[PDB]
């Protein structure tokens, strides 16, 4: 069909040729990614003979805007600011990264181009010359302190990688390599730990979970940051930080950028800000219902051309039974205002002292988002007469929500109120009428949820356990 | 099967040339499809080249045997 249309295009070229196409490309030149992807596609064997290659590397720099100086055929250096690296300012060449060496030795010039882009973004700092060198030094001190704090947790408890990610000081931390900055993994959702029962080992993927990056970024305001490692003396349990001043008032703060903005509620902003004065969003922007933002984050994880047009009526299909969940945004909280929140991408912290507290609040907000997020789905359940056991989620207190469903055996509405008090310790209470059939034991539901994943799922277990009895 | 072998090789050559033109136009998943469909075709043509190698062994001796018998019979 279209393979015969590709044969038709070849016939058209013959009527016209490959040489003519090359001439047209040359004329366009006179007037990156795809190549490397399809190059691995080809790679039964790799390019052995490589006459120039230097010319392509010069071209890659030209497109980047970097400056290339080459000493001999073997060594070529791309130099800008302190971002100087050589394939054979204020610091020694740190490492022969296997990551960069492997990509260059194999036919992946595209991957090398991405790595340079990362290095350029890290050093897109407004400050230049001496101011930039000190600012980088501050980032190095923060990295050393965060690394030590992670080491202390491992010494105190020999926890497995999963425990460190879910409930540990800092988080699984990978030290910065080339352009990539330090990544602290705040949370690994139970459903996504399982892929199509993954055992993490020390080989935990960079993106196999929720990850946050620590970096220095320029700010309009002026702040004091440690310019030397501040954990000179460490109390054996937890950490002790020697007081500031050393430090200098650089016009920037340390940041905890999140790759995908996390929807966060107004209550969390107050709970977090209690610990840290630094204004998170400073200029008060927009603040609408949280449940809408949670749906957008979940729906946009996988992008499709047609907007779901859910009307907050998400439909879920499960191995046994069919369920419809109404998210009920706009339900009044005790204060009389619907849960309202704004996406947060960057959180700024001066020192790491308040960081353990800030992360614990974030873990709770992320966990609540994941349980409510598991329901959001692209289901076209239209005219569904059989099954269709529908249940709904009204926000009744910041950090609490109620899923309401008809009693599985009897007829009265029964509601499970779940509060995300902890990241791994949501506490749920079943509300059932005085005359009703014992629907479930709170512990059995917990065991099924922990062994498996998500909350659309929790409702199935509640229905199945009641029916089995 | 010689005519079929020639045609099979010709199909690979013309489609590869058109793919080069498409790559010049490009600079996504259509070129990814073009690459993986070309993969199957030229890998089967590499198996036909392995058969051409054995044609330069067994089939070559067989052809020589027929030619030698002709002259010997005469």
């Amino acid at each position: 069909l279209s393979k015969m249309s590709s044969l038709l295009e070849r016939l058209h070229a013959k009527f016209n040729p490959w040489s003519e196409t090359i001439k047209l490309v040359r004329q366009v030149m006179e007037k990156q990614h795809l190549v490397s992807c399809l190059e691995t596609l080809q790679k039964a064997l790799k390019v052995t003979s490589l006459p120039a290659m230097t010319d392509r590397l010069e071209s890659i720099a030209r497109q980047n805007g970097l400056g290339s100086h080459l000493s001999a055929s073997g060594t070529e250096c791309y130099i800008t600011s302190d971002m100087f690296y050589v394939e054979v300012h204020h610091g020694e060449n740190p490492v022969s990264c296997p990551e960069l060496v492997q990509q260059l030795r194999e036919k992946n010039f595209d991957e090398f181009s991405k790595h340079l882009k990362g290095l350029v973004n890290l050093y897109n700092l407004p400050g230049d010359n001496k101011l930039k060198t000190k600012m980088y030094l501050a980032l190095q001190s923060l990295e050393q302190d965060l690394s030590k704090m992670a080491i202390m947790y491992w010494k105190a408890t020999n926890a497995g990688p999963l425990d460190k990610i879910l409930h540990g000081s800092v988080g699984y931390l990978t030290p910065r390599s080339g352009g990539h900055l330090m990544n602290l993994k705040y949370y690994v959702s139970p459903s996504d730990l399982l892929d199509d029962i993954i055992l993490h080992e020390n080989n935990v993927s960079r993106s196999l979970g929720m990850n946050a990056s620590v970096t220095i970024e320029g700010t309009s305001a002026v702040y004091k940051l440690p310019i030397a490692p501040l954990i000179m003396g460490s109390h054996p349990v937890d950490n002790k930080w020697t007081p500031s001043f050393n430090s200098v008032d650089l016009p920037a703060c340390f940041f905890l950028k999140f790759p995908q903005p996390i929807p966060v509620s107004r209550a969390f902003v107050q709970k977090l800000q209690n610990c840290t004065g630094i204004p998170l969003f400073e200029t008060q922007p927009t603040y609408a219902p949280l449940y809408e933002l949670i749906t957008q984050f979940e729906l946009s994880k996988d992008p499709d051309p047609i907007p779901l047009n859910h009307n907050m009526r998400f439909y879920a299909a499960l191995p046994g039974q069919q369920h419809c969940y109404f998210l009920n945004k706009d339900a009044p909280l005790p204060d009389g205002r619907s849960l309202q929140g704004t996406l947060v991408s960057k959180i700024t912290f001066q020192h790491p002292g308040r960081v353990p507290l800030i992360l614990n609040l974030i873990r709770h907000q992320v966990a609540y988002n994941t349980l409510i997020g598991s329901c959001v789905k692209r289901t076209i359940l239209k005219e569904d007469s059989p099954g269709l056991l529908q249940f709904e989620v009204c926000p009744l207190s910041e950090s609490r929500f109620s899923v309401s469903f008809q009693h599985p055996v009897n007829d009265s509405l029964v509601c499970v109120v779940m509060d995300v008090q902890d990241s791994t310790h949501v506490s749920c209470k079943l509300y059932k009428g005085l005359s009703d059939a014992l629907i479930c034991t709170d512990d059995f539901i917990a065991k099924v949820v922990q062994r498996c994943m998500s909350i659309p799922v929790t409702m199935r277990a509640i229905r199945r356990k009641a029916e089995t009895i | 099967t010689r005519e079929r072998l020639l045609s099979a090789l010709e199909d690979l050559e013309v489609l590869s040339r058109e793919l080069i033109e498409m790559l010049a136009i490009s600079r996504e998943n259509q070129v990814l499809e073009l690459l993986i469909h070309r993969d199957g075709e030229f890998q089967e043509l590499m198996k036909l080249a392995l058969n051409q190698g054995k044609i330069h062994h067994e089939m070559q001796v067989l052809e020589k045997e027929v030619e030698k018998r002709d002259s010997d019979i005469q």
Binding site: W18, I22, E39, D55, R56 | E13, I20
Partner: peptide, 29 residues
């Protein structure tokens, strides 16, 4: 054959039209 074409692909990435012409001569061979 294709191993020579793989060498031709390396030249095309490096630059090219001459390599495609070489592939046509290889088809004559």
């Amino acid at each position: 054959f294709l191993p020579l074409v793989h060498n031709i692909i390396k030249c095309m990435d490096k630059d090219q039209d001459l390599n495609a012409l070489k592939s046509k001569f290889q088809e004559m061979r």
